[model samples]
Target chain A: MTIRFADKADCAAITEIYNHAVLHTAAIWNDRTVDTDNRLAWYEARQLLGYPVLVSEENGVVTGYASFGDWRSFDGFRYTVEHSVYVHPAHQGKGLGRKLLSRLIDEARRCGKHVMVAGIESQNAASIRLHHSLGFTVTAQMPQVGVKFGRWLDLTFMQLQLDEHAAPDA
Target chain B: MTIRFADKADCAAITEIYNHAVLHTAAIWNDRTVDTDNRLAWYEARQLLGYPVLVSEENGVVTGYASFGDWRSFDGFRYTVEHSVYVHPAHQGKGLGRKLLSRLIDEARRCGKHVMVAGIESQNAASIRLHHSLGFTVTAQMPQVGVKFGRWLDLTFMQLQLDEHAAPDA
Candidate 1:
């Protein structure tokens, strides 16, 4: 298996994986399945923002994707980011998601970012464990802040400091 | 005491409150101070986004300020807003912060917002209580996600819901 930056060609498999999560799991908060063009537009927007959207592949078959976005919008919140990881059905229970996320964290550090944040479904133990193993610690837990799969959902937040003694400029 | 919309004339007071937060409190995560010009630029940016920048006053004295911003940068997080409430040192214990925040929440609801969030210092019990009184519930708790004043600070996230339905396609 290998990891690399994603492109338009990977959108179909990416959409499939994301929709599978939407239809059967609470790994994400999105409610509907988006077509290929939606993913293309998303890719373009991420490109415009200079963010990383990486795909996981084995034998040239895309299996999952990982990306990070601004955690909060204001300039005061600029240095923090929230990340998402999605794995294909055929590739669950394997360590592929971890590899993709680990590599993505390296990319974030390289960008001179100070903090990385994750907002996970509290009930999704697999994802919570994945982030924990990567040195991201649980920072906040809120109950019933979201709804998906026909039930109220809880959100757990986690964070990791990328570099030591880094201060935002005056 | 009076609480109303912040104006260009309030920039100096806003800057003083902000710089005091920078030097004396953990309300913000940064280590530097900004000038009034920067504060004015920020005030204008908030106006450009059509978000509110409100100030709390006593008779004719500006005592504190509050504002809401997009929680996450992308359009996905558009309906979810993160806000901050700051009070001047002389006004800290008069319950003015709560008054400022209560008004901000009303403004957020008036503008058709879905969620209003607060990311506060985990140990600031007063702030936490203020939020709880205003119907904000703890959503996330992150440990050591920030460093300030020679020590690490945890972040506590709380959010208030504005409505119980999906967003209208406007």
Candidate 2:
């Protein structure tokens, strides 16, 4: 398996993986699914910020993808990034999701991020457990803060400190 | 004392209290100060969303201000709002901050919000205590996620469920 920065050619596969999550999984709360153009534009935006949008390939097929974006708009939140990972239905249980997320953490740290946040659906034990195994800690839980699929949804926020600096730089 | 939705005339007083926090207090994490006109634009924008920008008045003068905005940009987060409250330094210990926030919470609920969030500087015990008194509970704690006045800043997120809605409406 090859883990690399995603290219334009990979957007379709990325879109497919993400749409599956949108339609069949609780991983994404959004009702609308995206197409290749949406993923292409998203890839370009992440690229312009020098942020990573990574993917895993097996036998020349994209199996999983991950990426991070600024968690909040305030200047005070400059050091924090919120990230997500998704794998094709066929790629589940092979640990590809973990691999993609592991690379995303490394990429975020390389980009000088100090903290990374994961906002998981509160009922998502599998994803939460995966993040916990990777050192993420549950920092927040709010019940019925979201609505999707004809029901109220709960949110669980987990975070990881990406680096330790003795002090902030000027 | 009367608390009401802020008008354009209240911008100067609001700016003074906010800029004081910006420069002297760790209550607000940002370093720059905004003028009254900047606040006028913010107020109008909040008005566009039908979100309240409120103030507490005494002797015909604004003593404090409070408001809330979307906690996150996603459609799923539509029911969650992050709020801020600031009182003029001279008005400290007079309970105006809490009063402003109390009214802000009512306004948020009136707007059909489900959750109100407060991301506070971790070291500000007074503010944290105030939120606790108002039924908000700490939800997240991250160390050294921010920087200000030449040092690292920690963040504590607190949240309150505004209602007992068994299910969200479409």
Top-DockQ structure, candidate number: 2
lDDT of 1 by residue, B1-170 (tens): 88899999999999999999888888987667999999999999999999999999887889999998877543335567788788999987789988999999999988878788898988989889999999988877776556566565667888888888754442
Residue pairs with colliding backbones in model 2 are none
The window of 10 residues in a row where model 1 chain A has the poorest summed lDDT is A143-152
DockQ of structure 2: 0.53
CA RMSD of each candidate after superposition: 4.6, 1.9
Q: What is the lDDT of residue A75 in candidate 2?
A: 67
A93-138 in candidate 2: lDDT tens per residue?
Answer: 9999888899999998788898899989998899999999999998
Output candidate 1 Cα RMSD. Answer: 4.6
List model 1 lDDT by residue over A1-170, tens digit each: 89999988998888898788777777777667888888888888988988999999989999899998877543455667788889998897889888998999998987766789888878778888888899988877765555554455567788888887645434
Most accurate candidate by lDDT = 2
DockQ (C-alpha based) per candidate is 0.20, 0.53
Error of 1 at A109 (Å): 7.0
Quote each prediction's TM-score.
0.74, 0.93
